[PDB]
Design a protein around this ligand. Structure first.
Ligand SMILES: *[C@@H]1O[C@H](CO)[C@@H](O[C@@H]2O[C@H](CO)[C@@H](O[C@@H]3O[C@H](CO[C@H]4O[C@H](CO)[C@@H](O)[C@H](O)[C@@H]4O)[C@@H](O)[C@H](O[C@H]4O[C@H](CO)[C@@H](O)[C@H](O)[C@@H]4O[C@H]4O[C@H](CO)[C@@H](O)[C@H](O)[C@@H]4O)[C@@H]3O)[C@H](O)[C@H]2NC(C)=O)[C@H](O)[C@H]1NC(C)=O
Ligand SMILES: *[C@@H]1O[C@H](CO)[C@@H](O[C@@H]2O[C@H](CO)[C@@H](O[C@@H]3O[C@H](CO)[C@@H](O)[C@H](O)[C@@H]3O)[C@H](O)[C@H]2NC(C)=O)[C@H](O)[C@H]1NC(C)=O
Ligand SMILES: *[C@@H]1O[C@H](CO)[C@@H](O[C@@H]2O[C@H](CO)[C@@H](O[C@@H]3O[C@H](CO)[C@@H](O)[C@H](O)[C@@H]3O)[C@H](O)[C@H]2NC(C)=O)[C@H](O)[C@H]1NC(C)=O
Ligand SMILES: *[C@@H]1O[C@H](CO)[C@@H](O[C@@H]2O[C@H](CO)[C@@H](O)[C@H](O)[C@H]2NC(C)=O)[C@H](O)[C@H]1NC(C)=O
Ligand SMILES: *[C@@H]1O[C@H](CO)[C@@H](O[C@@H]2O[C@H](CO)[C@@H](O)[C@H](O)[C@H]2NC(C)=O)[C@H](O)[C@H]1NC(C)=O
Ligand SMILES: *[C@@H]1O[C@H](CO)[C@@H](O[C@@H]2O[C@H](CO)[C@@H](O)[C@H](O)[C@H]2NC(C)=O)[C@H](O)[C@H]1NC(C)=O
Ligand SMILES: *[C@@H]1O[C@H](CO)[C@@H](O[C@@H]2O[C@H](CO)[C@@H](O)[C@H](O)[C@H]2NC(C)=O)[C@H](O)[C@H]1NC(C)=O
Ligand SMILES: *[C@@H]1O[C@H](CO)[C@@H](O[C@@H]2O[C@H](CO)[C@@H](O)[C@H](O)[C@H]2NC(C)=O)[C@H](O)[C@H]1NC(C)=O
Ligand SMILES: CC(=O)N[C@@H]1[C@@H](O)[C@@H](O)[C@@H](CO)O[C@@H]1O
Ligand SMILES: *[C@@H]1O[C@H](CO)[C@@H](O)[C@H](O)[C@H]1NC(C)=O
Ligand SMILES: *[C@@H]1O[C@H](CO)[C@@H](O)[C@H](O)[C@H]1NC(C)=O
Ligand SMILES: *[C@@H]1O[C@H](CO)[C@@H](O)[C@H](O)[C@H]1NC(C)=O
Ligand SMILES: *[C@@H]1O[C@H](CO)[C@@H](O)[C@H](O)[C@H]1NC(C)=O
Ligand SMILES: *[C@@H]1O[C@H](CO)[C@@H](O)[C@H](O)[C@H]1NC(C)=O
Ligand SMILES: *[C@@H]1O[C@H](CO)[C@@H](O)[C@H](O)[C@H]1NC(C)=O
Ligand SMILES: *[C@@H]1O[C@H](CO)[C@@H](O)[C@H](O)[C@H]1NC(C)=O
Lengths: 363, 398, 313
């Protein structure tokens, strides 16, 4: 006997063999000896089973010698073996139906854990053999779970099941709600306006969104300053968050976390938490800001750099005609006895100047 | 005219023959009745002096489901329906050949729908009893046992030359006009407990049935006055495809009470539960008989619902419906017919047999008996009539 | 593989040897009859009530002719009180049950049959006045006019009395209709018994009166022309008769053809399909007649609106 596979809802073809070519009487019985279809002259008799409004047969092929068995809306409980009956013979066949789906429909954020749900029939030993466009042919038991699911792991994954040298393909609906950044670092100087931008990708749904941006100021342990904002449709509206930073937020989904002037106490790390629902879950993203303060105290000058600074960087203060008058690896470097010129401060990282600030000395 | 000679004495060795027999019916050759036209062009008059030679001590194994004689009658009635009711649209399938290389895929989707358009005259229709007679050199045997068991050997074998009155009536779920049982309602089936072969039940008492349509479709009231223009007289008001039958409940209950007694002896004291059929074609779910091109499709759900128990002892309204587009029992395909005719049509019929299927299973627990109505295979319709006979060829030494 | 037999549609028609697709012709007529019948009912009601006001109080019904003119307007009112029902019957259906249908059907024919009966009495009264002037004076008492009219109403009731034998209404076709279901056992007798009664009493009998009476009256015109007012008086009664014939005799001819579609007349179904559009028009023309008799009185009649004839010209 042979074996075929079902795809949980489609049609299946189960044919018999007959070499008489006389349109002789056929039957269709399961292992429990229950009639489903049968020949009556040239007529079709839907037998007394649980597949009354589902079983079908192609009458045009009856004068050939092939008698199919078309069953629509394949369920899991319909997995059984069927025997044919032509010219006093028993052509035994076999039938297996199974299914596979997820539980989270559209709320699959970037970095959210993946869950599967395999619906295999009892009395069978399946084997999950998936295929990913990133080359992940993950094999295992019946239930498979992956911790990683991002924007680059979306798409209809081809998960097939090998059992008795037979396999059929399937697809997986993945809607990925992700950001387009892990950590932004914005390099500004004292006085310059600071702009933050963290995008998303056009998802439309009902009441879903509310979140907030946490902040950790440099050397200021006075925490609990944030900004809380709500999300409902094309539109951005702050609920209410109040405090020292005059953070103005735009009205559209390209979020503009605007900061008026880069004061030196407004520097440090930060975390952007976004939370949607219908399937709850929380996104996270790192926010950083570096502030440079170049201001002469007296006829001698002094400059300093605030923010999440690296232990590998450089700092230089030069009068832009000659080379560097001082070069150190710190955050507060000073120059005594300067000269006339447009003094430049250089913040860099292994090759490339990040920040630049101009200042003049009158003598 | 025809003429054959007897055999005064012969008991030689018997050999199963598959020769071609000639019909012999009492026709009229003047009326416009189709069965009188068909019998005139191909049938001969009946034998006025039949001879049945009784064999004292002779037995034979009359197998009946392997009878090749019923395969000839089935090919002789299909030749009558192509001369009786010419369809307006005869849609039949026609495929050719599509295979790959059982080992290679068997997807055969190449099939052509040939349609034939013919004229549709509404003609008369009434069956006539025919007699199949043996040709030169052969003989037809006949048992006389009152039970005969189906495919079982009897002992009272007698030889004849022509069969008894056989009507070509085509029906499902209830065997119409034909011969009755001798003394007791007997059941016949090729193999019991295998729930695939139909069980032929032959009755010993004729249950009558009257199937007619009331002539109230056309209006006879005249609105003589302000109207008399739109709603004018002879305008159809009722459904012209609706009829009704009646079954004598006080007489039909007796015959059905004898069927369940035969089943109890055969199947060892079970609970006989009749049911309606399990679905399928409308020629199988419902009753189907013919009366002058009126193809009555009678709902028999109020005829087989009743469940049975031991200690057993007026006008059942049987709702029928005339359907134009009918399936052809001869070959795959359909045949659209003409609209019905003007007048009262009465089918004062008989009920001589009963076709029943069986629903046995091992998923269901130890005791149940479901007997849904079956039939539809017209070869099984005339196996209930040609069970007594058998065509055998006896070689002559001369 | 692709079989084209899937159609649940069916046709309510029997099988014959000539397929005849007969059009209902109700909707096209239902967009033309309710405003027309309403217009007839408007003009007819105010028309005849004026002819009742004028004769009762302005003329004084001092003679047997004025009595018949009154009763002719009353006969037209019996016709008129059924007109809004039929206006609201082509438009939709019969909403009035049946108990009132044995009265309304009768009132239709009481309006119809008495309508021609008093016109004949008008003709005979004017015929007697011109030829048998000695005999007419003895028998033209207003008292004798009343008792003649009372008999005339009774006969008009009896002339509709076979129609009241059965008026039962049941839902046949689209909506309930009140079609008289006379007995089936003698069906051929009653059906032919109704065509003649309208045609004899409504067409044959007044034609026989018109031939006889107006041949005796025209004899006076051959003798002398001395009295214009005698000649002008005949013009009123003559006009009423012929306008009745202009509006009702096309229906009477068609009504004979409606029953006699057998060997007597025409057998083609297309001959009966033009006839389906002929019966309703001539019945509608007959329906309009009930408002015409006051219009005739304002044109021909030189006693009612004679000053309007001079004022118009
Ligand atoms: C099983 O066996 C039984 C026999 O026991 C059989 O019943 C018989 O069926 C036939 C077929 O319908 C019946 O034959 C019809 O009979 C009617 C009535 O005949 C009566 O005549 C007089 C007067 O009433 C009675 O005294 C007498 O006892 C009969 O009861 C006839 O009118 C039929 O002829 C008309 O129909 C034919 C087909 O439509 C036409 O070809 C024929 O010319 C006649 O047509 C006229 O009427 C039509 C009405 O529609 C009209 O369309 C035509 O234009 C024309 O005007 C017909 O001969 C017979 O009576 C039944 N026997 C009994 C005792 O009733 C069953 O049929 C059979 N089972 C099966 C499945 O076949
Ligand atoms: C074996 O089969 C033969 C078949 O002929 C049986 O013979 C028939 O027997 C019946 C009675 O069982 C006879 O019927 C009777 O006939 C007489 C005289 O005709 C009549 O007066 C009675 O009213 C009754 O109808 C029948 O005639 C007879 N057949 C012939 C041709 O004579 C025989 O009985 C069977 N044997 C057994 C043991 O079943
Ligand atoms: C005249 O024709 C009509 C139909 O064309 C026939 O009427 C039908 O009569 C049957 C039984 O006499 C009705 O069945 C019953 O219906 C009621 C209401 O649905 C139901 O409650 C009962 O249990 C039963 O089923 C059938 O409905 C009725 N058809 C119509 C359309 O009313 C009538 O029998 C004919 N006349 C004669 C004399 O036969
Ligand atoms: C009636 O038919 C049945 C089967 O169709 C016969 O039953 C068989 O009879 C043979 C011998 O005659 C036995 O060897 C089998 O074991 C029987 N099978 C069953 C299932 O019973 C039965 O004998 C026939 N009766 C007569 C009188 O011939
Ligand atoms: C009728 O059909 C049954 C099957 O339903 C046959 O019974 C089988 O007989 C063979 C040989 O005797 C056994 O090997 C099977 O196990 C039997 N099957 C069952 C379900 O019992 C029976 O032989 C058939 N009878 C006839 C006369 O054909
Ligand atoms: C078939 O059965 C119906 C149902 O009883 C019968 O119809 C009745 O007929 C009698 C006349 O004997 C009438 O008085 C009843 O009013 C009918 N009943 C209904 C519900 O309409 C019909 O007569 C039977 N036909 C035959 C041939 O017996
Ligand atoms: C079906 O019709 C037949 C004949 O029209 C009926 O048979 C007759 O029935 C009456 C009483 O109903 C008896 O007096 C007659 O002797 C019967 N004649 C024959 C030849 O049988 C029969 O009764 C009808 N059946 C039903 C259920 O109405
Ligand atoms: C239908 O059943 C009736 C039941 O009475 C049959 O009528 C009798 O049939 C026998 C057998 O030929 C005759 O001897 C009787 O004379 C019949 N009785 C009457 C009153 O006529 C009837 O023959 C059956 N129909 C058919 C076609 O066999
Ligand atoms: C019975 C009925 O409605 N007949 C029609 C038939 O005329 C034809 O149009 C057919 C299409 O193949 O659909 C059906
Ligand atoms: C037939 O069998 C019977 C047994 O009763 C016997 O008497 C008879 O002689 C047999 N017939 C022949 C021809 O031997
Ligand atoms: C399909 O049927 C038509 C009509 O019978 C015939 O002419 C045509 O050749 C057929 N085509 C094929 C491919 O069989
Ligand atoms: C079955 O019926 C038979 C009838 O002869 C009877 O003898 C037997 O006892 C019954 N068996 C049961 C279990 O009722
Ligand atoms: C059959 O009859 C029973 C009562 O005996 C009833 O409950 C049941 O509904 C009937 N069957 C159908 C299909 O209506
Ligand atoms: C059969 O009838 C007897 C009494 O007549 C009763 O005791 C028994 O229960 C019945 N059988 C069934 C299955 O009900
Ligand atoms: C029909 O048979 C059953 C069997 O039990 C019985 O109960 C019923 O009374 C019978 N009906 C008639 C009308 O004889
Ligand atoms: C059916 O029979 C089996 C074996 O005899 C038994 O085990 C089972 O209990 C029976 N079923 C019922 C419902 O008694």
């Amino acid at each position: 006997k042979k074996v075929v596979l079902g795809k949980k809802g489609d049609t299946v073809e189960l044919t018999c063999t007959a070499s008489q070519k006389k349109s002789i009487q056929f039957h269709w019985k399961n292992s429990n000896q229950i009639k489903i279809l049968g020949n009556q002259g040239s007529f079709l008799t839907k037998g007394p089973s649980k597949l009354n409004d589902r079983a079908d047969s192609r009458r045009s092929l009856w004068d050939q010698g092939n008698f199919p068995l078309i069953i629509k809306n394949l369920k899991i409980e319909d997995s059984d073996t069927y025997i044919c009956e032509v010219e006093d013979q028993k052509e035994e066949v076999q039938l297996l139906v199974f299914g596979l789906t997820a539980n989270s429909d559209t709320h699959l954020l970037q970095g959210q854990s993946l869950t599967l749900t395999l619906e295999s029939p009892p009395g069978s030993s399946p084997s999950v053999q998936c295929r990913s466009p990133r080359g992940k042919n993950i094999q295992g038991g019946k239930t498979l779970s992956v911790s990683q699911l991002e924007l680059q792991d979306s798409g209809t994954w081809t998960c097939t099941v090998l059992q008795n040298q037979k396999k059929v393909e399937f697809k997986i609906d993945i809607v990925v709600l992700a950001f387009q950044k892990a950590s932004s670092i914005v390099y500004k100087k004292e006085g310059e306006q600071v702009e933050f931008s963290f995008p998303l990708a056009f998802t439309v749904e009902k009441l879903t969104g509310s979140g907030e941006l946490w902040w950790q100021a440099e050397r200021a342990s006075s925490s609990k300053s944030w900004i809380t904002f709500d999300l409902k449709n094309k539109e951005v509206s702050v609920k209410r968050v109040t405090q020292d930073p005059k953070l103005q937020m735009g009205k559209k989904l390209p979020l503009h976390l605007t900061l008026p002037q880069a004061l030196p106490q407004y520097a440090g790390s930060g975390n952007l938490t976004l939370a949607l629902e219908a399937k709850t879950g929380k996104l996270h993203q790192e926010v950083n800001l570096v502030v440079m303060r170049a201001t002469q105290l007296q006829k001698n000058l002094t400059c300093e750099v605030w923010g999440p600074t690296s232990p590998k960087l450089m700092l230089s203060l030069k009068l832009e005609n000659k080379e560097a008058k001082v070069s150190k690896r710190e955050k507060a470097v000073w120059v005594l006895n300067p000269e006339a010129g447009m003094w430049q401060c250089l913040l860099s990282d292994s090759g490339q100047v990040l920040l630049e600030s101009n200042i003049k000395v009158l003598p | 005219d025809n003429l054959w000679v007897t055999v005064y004495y012969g008991v030689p060795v018997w050999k199963e023959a598959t020769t071609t027999l000639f019909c012999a019916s009492d026709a009229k050759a003047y009326k416009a009745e189709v069965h009188n036209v068909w019998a005139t062009h191909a049938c001969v008059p009946t034998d006025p002096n039949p001879q049945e030679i009784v064999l004292e001590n002779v037995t034979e194994n009359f197998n009946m489901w392997k009878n090749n004689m019923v395969e000839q009658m089935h090919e002789d009635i299909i030749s009558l329906w192509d001369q009786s009711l010419k369809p307006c649209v005869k849609l039949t399938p026609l495929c050719v050949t599509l295979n790959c290389i059982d080992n290679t895929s068997y997807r055969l989707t190449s099939c052509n729908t040939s349609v034939i358009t013919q004229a549709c005259p509404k003609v008369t229709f009434e069956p006539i009893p025919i007699h199949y007679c043996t040709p030169a050199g052969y003989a037809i045997l006949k048992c006389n046992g009152k039970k005969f068991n189906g495919t079982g050997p009897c002992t009272n074998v007698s030889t004849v030359q022509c069969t008894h009155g056989i009507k070509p009536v085509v029906s499902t779920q209830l065997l119409l006009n034909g011969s009755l049982a001798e003394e007791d309602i007997v059941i016949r089936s090729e193999n019991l407990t295998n729930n695939a072969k139909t069980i032929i039940v032959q009755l010993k008492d004729p249950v009558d049935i009257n199937c007619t349509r009331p002539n109230n479709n056309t209006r006879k009231s005249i609105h003589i006055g302000p109207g008399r223009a739109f709603y004018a007289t002879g305008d159809i008001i009722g459904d012209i495809r609706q009829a009704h039958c009646n079954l004598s409940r006080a007489q039909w209950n007796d015959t059905l009470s004898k069927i369940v007694t035969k089943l109890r002896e055969q199947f060892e004291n079970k609970t006989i539960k009749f049911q309606p059929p399990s679905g399928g074609d409308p020629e199988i779910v419902f009753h189907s008989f013919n009366c002058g091109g009126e193809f009555f499709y009678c709902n028999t759900t109020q005829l087989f619902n009743s469940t049975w128990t031991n200690n057993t002892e007026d006008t059942i309204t049987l709702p029928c419906r005339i359907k134009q587009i009918v399936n052809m029992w001869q070959e795959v395909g359909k045949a659209m017919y003409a609209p019905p005719i003007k007048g009262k049509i009465k089918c004062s019929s008989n009920i001589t047999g009963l076709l029943l299927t069986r629903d046995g299973g091992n998923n269901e627990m130890n005791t149940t008996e479901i007997f849904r109505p079956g039939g539809g295979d017209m070869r099984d319709n005339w196996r209930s009539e040609l069970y007594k006979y058998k065509v055998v060829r006896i070689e002559p030494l001369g | 593989m692709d079989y084209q037999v899937s159609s649940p549609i069916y046709d309510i028609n029997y099988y014959t040897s000539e397929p005849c697709q007969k059009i209902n012709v109700k909707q096209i007529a239902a967009r033309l009859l309710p405003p027309l019948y309403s217009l007839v009912f408007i003009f007819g009601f105010v028309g005849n009530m004026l002819v009742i006001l004028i004769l009762i109080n302005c003329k004084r019904l001092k003679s047997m002719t004025d009595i018949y003119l009154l009763n002719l307007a009353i006969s037209d009112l019996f016709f008129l009180l059924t007109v809004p029902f039929w206006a609201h019957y082509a438009a939709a259906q019969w909403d009035f049950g049946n108990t009132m249908c044995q009265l309304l059907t009768g009132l239709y024919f009481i309006g119809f049959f008495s309508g021609i009966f008093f016109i004949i009495l008008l003709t005979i009264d004017r015929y007697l006045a011109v030829v048998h002037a000695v005999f007419a004076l003895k028998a033209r008492t207003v008292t004798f006019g009343v008792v003649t009219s009372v008999i005339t109403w009774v006969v008009a009731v009896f002339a509709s009395l076979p129609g009241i034998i059965f008026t039962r209404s049941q839902k046949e076709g689209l909506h309930y209709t009140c079609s008289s279901h006379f007995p089936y056992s003698q069906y051929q007798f009653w059906k032919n018994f109704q065509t003649l009664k309208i045609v004899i009493l409504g067409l044959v009998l007044p034609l026989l009166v018109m031939v006889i009476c107006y041949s005796g009256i025209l004899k006076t015109l051959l003798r002398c022309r001395n009295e214009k007012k005698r000649h002008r008086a005949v013009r009123l009664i003559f006009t009423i008769m012929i306008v009745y014939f202009l509006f009702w005799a096309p229906y009477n001819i068609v009504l004979l053809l409606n029953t006699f579609q057998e060997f007597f007349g025409l057998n083609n179904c297309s001959s009966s399909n033009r006839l389906d559009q002929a019966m309703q028009v001539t019945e509608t023309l007959g329906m309009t007649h009930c408002c015409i008799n006051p219009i005739i009185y304002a044109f021909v009649g030189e006693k009612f609106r004679n000053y309007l004839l001079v004022f118009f010209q």
